């Protein structure tokens, strides 16, 4: 559904995923920062698009980035 992307400006503060209410994100090891971790987005099918991840990305503009795309029943957040 939605296309979440994490760019290489991430500092690995784990706010993107601790804010994400649908388990879309997960921190993985990395070698590009002092924290040695970066966020990944495997479960984009569970992405609703609420952008709580990028409302918590403390960078110049953003490192995590949500692109609104094909909306399915779970990205639209329907219990019916």
């Amino acid at each position: 559904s939605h296309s979440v992307k994490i760019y290489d400006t991430c500092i690995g503060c784990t706010q993107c995923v601790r804010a994400c209410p649908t388990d879309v994100l997960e921190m993985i090891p990395w070698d590009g920062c002092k924290a040695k971790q970066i966020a990944s987005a495997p479960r984009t099918e569970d992405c609703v698009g609420c952008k709580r991840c990028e409302s918590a990305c403390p960078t110049d503009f953003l490192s995590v980035r949500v692109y609104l795309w094909h909306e399915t029943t779970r990205s639209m957040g329907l219990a019916y």
């Binding site: 290489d8 070698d31 920062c33 409302s55 403390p58 110049d60 503009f61």
Partner: protein, 69 residues
């Protein structure tokens, strides 16, 4: 090199990154990650916050340029 690679701690620096809030604005380098594998070591501290109420951001060495002052 083990000696510093980037600007000095306190060197007021300009941002050449086009997507940042402080583009073509000066800053104040508070730290430079001397690890020669990180992509954006230059920790800058600006005076005025961005839209997310943040005054600091990591920048690269090529995305930064020190002023003549």
């Amino acid at each position: 090199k083990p000696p510093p690679i980037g600007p000095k701690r306190g060197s007021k620096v300009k941002i050449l990154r086009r997507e940042s809030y402080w583009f073509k604005n000066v800053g104040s380098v508070v730290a430079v990650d001397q690890d020669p594998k990180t992509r954006y070591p230059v920790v800058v501290r600006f005076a005025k916050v961005n839209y997310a109420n943040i005054s600091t951001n990591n920048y690269a060495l090529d995305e930064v340029e020190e002023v003549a002052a």
